[PDB]
Design an enzyme around this catalytic site. Structure first.
Site, mmCIF file in Angstrom:
data_model
loop_
_atom_site.group_PDB
_atom_site.id
_atom_site.type_symbol
_atom_site.label_atom_id
_atom_site.label_comp_id
_atom_site.label_asym_id
_atom_site.label_seq_id
_atom_site.Cartn_x
_atom_site.Cartn_y
_atom_site.Cartn_z
ATOM 1 N N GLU A 94 0.840 -1.219 0.000
ATOM 2 C CA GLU A 94 0.000 0.000 0.000
ATOM 3 C C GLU A 94 0.872 1.265 0.000
ATOM 4 O OE1 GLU A 94 -2.559 -1.802 3.294
ATOM 5 O OE2 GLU A 94 -3.989 -0.561 2.211
ATOM 6 N N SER A 98 -6.392 -2.379 0.878
ATOM 7 C CA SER A 98 -6.536 -1.826 -0.474
ATOM 8 C C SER A 98 -6.971 -2.870 -1.506
ATOM 9 C CB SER A 98 -5.221 -1.145 -0.901
ATOM 10 O OG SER A 98 -4.998 0.019 -0.130
ATOM 11 N N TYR A 157 -9.008 3.674 -5.939
ATOM 12 C CA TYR A 157 -7.996 4.749 -6.057
ATOM 13 C C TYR A 157 -7.847 5.429 -7.397
ATOM 14 C CZ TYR A 157 -6.702 2.536 -1.732
ATOM 15 O OH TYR A 157 -6.718 1.948 -0.482
ATOM 16 N N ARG A 203 -11.781 2.902 10.659
ATOM 17 C CA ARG A 203 -12.900 2.743 9.741
ATOM 18 C C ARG A 203 -13.245 1.277 9.608
ATOM 19 N NH1 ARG A 203 -10.876 3.066 5.030
ATOM 20 N NH2 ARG A 203 -11.917 1.100 4.505
ATOM 21 N N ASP A 251 -15.482 -1.761 7.747
ATOM 22 C CA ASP A 251 -16.169 -2.080 6.488
ATOM 23 C C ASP A 251 -17.228 -3.149 6.711
ATOM 24 O OD1 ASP A 251 -14.332 -0.288 5.302
ATOM 25 O OD2 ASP A 251 -13.033 -1.901 4.603
ATOM 26 N N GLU A 262 -14.002 -6.128 8.140
ATOM 27 C CA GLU A 262 -12.691 -5.829 8.741
ATOM 28 C C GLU A 262 -12.694 -4.455 9.357
ATOM 29 O OE1 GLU A 262 -9.340 -4.546 6.528
ATOM 30 O OE2 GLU A 262 -10.615 -3.375 5.118
ATOM 31 N N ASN A 287 -10.003 -1.133 9.965
ATOM 32 C CA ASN A 287 -8.757 -0.484 9.545
ATOM 33 C C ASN A 287 -8.348 0.599 10.503
ATOM 34 O OD1 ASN A 287 -8.550 -1.653 6.643
ATOM 35 N ND2 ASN A 287 -10.677 -0.905 6.776
ATOM 36 N N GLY A 290 -7.076 5.127 4.802
ATOM 37 C CA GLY A 290 -6.658 5.973 3.703
ATOM 38 C C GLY A 290 -7.084 7.417 3.904
HETATM 39 N N1 LIG Z 1 -17.395 -11.737 1.554
HETATM 40 C C1 LIG Z 1 -17.385 -10.756 0.635
HETATM 41 N N2 LIG Z 1 -18.296 -10.732 -0.354
HETATM 42 C C2 LIG Z 1 -18.331 -9.795 -1.308
HETATM 43 N N3 LIG Z 1 -17.442 -8.773 -1.386
HETATM 44 C C3 LIG Z 1 -16.468 -8.729 -0.462
HETATM 45 C C4 LIG Z 1 -16.396 -9.676 0.621
HETATM 46 N N4 LIG Z 1 -15.322 -9.330 1.378
HETATM 47 C C5 LIG Z 1 -14.772 -8.248 0.808
HETATM 48 N N5 LIG Z 1 -15.478 -7.881 -0.295
HETATM 49 C C6 LIG Z 1 -15.170 -6.756 -1.199
HETATM 50 O O1 LIG Z 1 -13.737 -6.679 -1.196
HETATM 51 C C7 LIG Z 1 -13.315 -5.395 -0.726
HETATM 52 C C8 LIG Z 1 -12.048 -5.463 0.155
HETATM 53 O O2 LIG Z 1 -12.302 -6.379 1.214
HETATM 54 P P1 LIG Z 1 -11.853 -6.012 2.723
HETATM 55 O O3 LIG Z 1 -12.356 -4.615 3.130
HETATM 56 O O4 LIG Z 1 -12.204 -7.216 3.552
HETATM 57 O O5 LIG Z 1 -10.232 -5.980 2.631
HETATM 58 P P2 LIG Z 1 -9.171 -4.776 2.431
HETATM 59 O O6 LIG Z 1 -8.274 -5.205 1.299
HETATM 60 O O7 LIG Z 1 -8.418 -4.658 3.759
HETATM 61 O O8 LIG Z 1 -9.941 -3.373 2.190
HETATM 62 P P3 LIG Z 1 -9.259 -1.727 2.699
HETATM 63 O O9 LIG Z 1 -8.724 -0.783 1.671
HETATM 64 O O10 LIG Z 1 -10.429 -1.084 3.255
HETATM 65 O O11 LIG Z 1 -8.197 -1.707 3.741
HETATM 66 C C9 LIG Z 1 -14.531 -4.886 0.031
HETATM 67 O O12 LIG Z 1 -14.521 -3.452 0.128
HETATM 68 C C10 LIG Z 1 -15.713 -5.413 -0.769
HETATM 69 O O13 LIG Z 1 -15.924 -4.680 -1.993
HETATM 70 MG MG LIG Z 2 -8.441 -3.122 5.065
HETATM 71 MG MG LIG Z 3 -11.609 -2.851 3.372
HETATM 72 MG MG LIG Z 4 -8.330 9.989 -9.266
#
Ligand SMILES: Nc1ncnc2c1ncn2[C@@H]1O[C@H](COP(=O)(O)OP(=O)(O)OP(=O)(O)O)[C@@H](O)[C@H]1O
Ligand SMILES: [Mg+2]
Ligand SMILES: [Mg+2]
Ligand SMILES: [Mg+2]
Ligand SMILES: Nc1ncnc2c1ncn2[C@@H]1O[C@H](COP(=O)(O)OP(=O)(O)OP(=O)(O)O)[C@@H](O)[C@H]1O
Ligand SMILES: [Mg+2]
Ligand SMILES: [Mg+2]
Ligand SMILES: [Mg+2]
Ligand SMILES: [Mg+2]
EC number: 6.3.2.4
Lengths: 306, 306
Positions: free
Chosen positions: A15, A150, A216, A255, A257, A270, A272, A276
């Protein structure tokens, strides 16, 4: 002299590019707010030297392992510099999606059905037990590294053969990976700032999920703040996020999600603990809806440090 | 020169005196093993200076928060010094009994029924919901701080009117406290060394529980190694400890405390990621039953470091 603040940005995680942009925005917001802030990239500068370099406090604008996972927090604690965001334990736990899920499930909180795998297990071949657990998730599924951000290393799997390739991708990023039931959405996120839960956001990607490009680099993603829920559902979502936050032990800001599924229920994805802060980022959107300039937001996050 | 090892001992926790004794034993065992080891007390010496002082690796013989809870591990990770025992996450989690319990329950593992309370809640007056949850545990109960060791802050409550004083005591030591169902025993502990599960120990205190005096200052406590279980129950105990260890993410070495309850089932109490190494201590007893000298034990622990 007034306090010299180090804004930690960049680093060496997947990231990095996002963090460079978050730090750039934070630095400007802090200087606009009258704070004597300076950018410091741990890829370039030995962060064990911050105190020797004359810094009084640290704004953490790093993302991923080594900035967000308790490691840096521990070093800052022992150096005696106040820093933004969650402490050692909550940062380490929030980075670890597998262990966050276990904690939240132990606390009776809603999480998507899932299977956890280690790289060593995958290399040898899975047990009949594991294959049956995976089959019971149905398809599609999402595959994710445990300790990324991300949307790095993530993919949607719609055919059994391709699960192998999805697992291989995620195992490039972590030795522990999650396979999760695909949730229908819609998707939400909720920012926390001190004791304040900020206005919720509903996120609508143009593609299959909120992937790296949708986060992004796309002008197609749509956002709604507040999320436009019925008042009772907005209250449900806020109470869920607050319990998830307190269960992990997080502090300062962060934050969480969340997604709806087809059963109409909210599921936690999750937390965070170093969110960001880029022009495309979600905490700034929530803060703007709460009547804050970006400068006011970052000054507040800094004021909350130890 | 060959490697200079810092043995960190003492520090400033409630377990300082235990740690001074653990470190004294470890120092001698390392030097008998041909290792150029030196004692370093973080109460006296700025631990951020270890690399500057010429040390190559660190043997952590500290106990409690600030040596065992991930904070020091984070500092050493960023300083680039290999160190013994678990990483940042698993050390932080193992110190936090509340979050270990949630993790373990989330993973389907056996834990005593419990209620968690915060100091702020206790200061104001507990909710009817919390009072009802405490009542449902029945009596007796044990009260413990979440983040202590060495039985510090703990007491048995046999009467409703004495619960308040037990809570007040535990809240001297942490802002988060656990009230747990009283388990009948007997009591066990199992040490892990790398991939090896060491012979089990059954512990029989002379009094109510394995309190600080029973641990460190009594000739009345009895120990049985191996624990004297039937083969199938010994296998059950080992399998439960290994799953608890892997669920936490621990590495290197450690010790998990377990008790039988009146239903004849094992319940997990806690994991310890920097175990005592005093003449009264349990990991050395397990190692001796496994045919090792104390010197061989500490050399192996050090060999396992990153
Ligand atoms: N079980 C699921 N079913 C459908 N979509 C999912 C699921 N889990 C995650 N997603 C999608 O994948 C994206 C990223 O998943 P998640 O937030 O778990 O991990 P991340 O890579 O840490 O995200 P971040 O940038 O917030 O740190 C989510 O924002 C959502 O769009
Ligand atoms: Mg995350
Ligand atoms: Mg996420
Ligand atoms: Mg842009
Ligand atoms: N639920 C319970 N019922 C009965 N006895 C208990 C219970 N929980 C703990 N004990 C007793 O209290 C002692 C200390 O509890 P525990 O191991 O949970 O905390 P600790 O203070 O971290 O111990 P250590 O020195 O191993 O670090 C146990 O060894 C056992 O004798
Ligand atoms: Mg193929
Ligand atoms: Mg303990
Ligand atoms: Mg003695
Ligand atoms: Mg114990």
């Amino acid at each position: 002299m007034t306090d010299k603040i180090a804004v930690l940005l960049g680093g060496t995680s997947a990231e990095r590019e996002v963090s460079l942009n978050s730090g750039a925005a934070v630095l400007a917001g802090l200087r606009e707010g009258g704070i004597d802030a300076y950018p410091v990239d741990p890829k370039e500068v030995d962060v064990t030297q911050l105190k020797s370099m004359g810094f009084q406090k640290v704004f953490i604008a790093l993302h991923g392992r080594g900035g967000e996972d308790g490691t840096l927090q521990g070093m800052l604690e022992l150096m005696g510099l106040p820093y933004t965001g969650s402490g050692v334990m909550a940062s380490a736990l929030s980075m670890d999606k597998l262990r966050s899920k276990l904690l939240w499930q132990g606390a009776g909180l809603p999480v998507a059905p899932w299977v956890a795998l280690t790289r060593a297990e995958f290399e040898k071949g899975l047990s009949d037990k594991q294959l049956a657990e995976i089959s019971a998730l149905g398809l599609p599924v999402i595959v994710k590294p445990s300790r990324e951000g991300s949307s790095v290393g993530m993919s949607k799997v719609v055919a059994e053969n391709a699960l192998q390739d999805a697992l291989r991708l995620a195992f490039q990023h972590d030795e522990e990976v999650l396979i999760e039931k695909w949730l229908s959405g819609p998707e939400f996120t909720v920012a926390i700032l001190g004791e304040e839960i900020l206005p919720s956001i509903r996120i609508q990607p143009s593609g299959t999920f909120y992937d790296y490009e949708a986060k992004y680099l796309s002008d197609e993603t749509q956002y709604f703040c507040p999320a436009g829920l019925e008042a009772s559902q907005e209250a449900n979502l806020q109470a869920l996020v607050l319990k998830a936050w307190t269960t992990l032990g997080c502090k300062g800001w962060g934050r969480i999600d969340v997604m709806l599924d087809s059963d109409g229920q909210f599921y936690l994805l999750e937390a965070n603990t170093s969110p960001g802060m880029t022009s495309h980022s979600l905490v700034p959107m929530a803060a703007r809806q709460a009547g804050m300039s970006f400068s006011q937001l970052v000054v507040r996050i800094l004021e909350l440090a130890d």
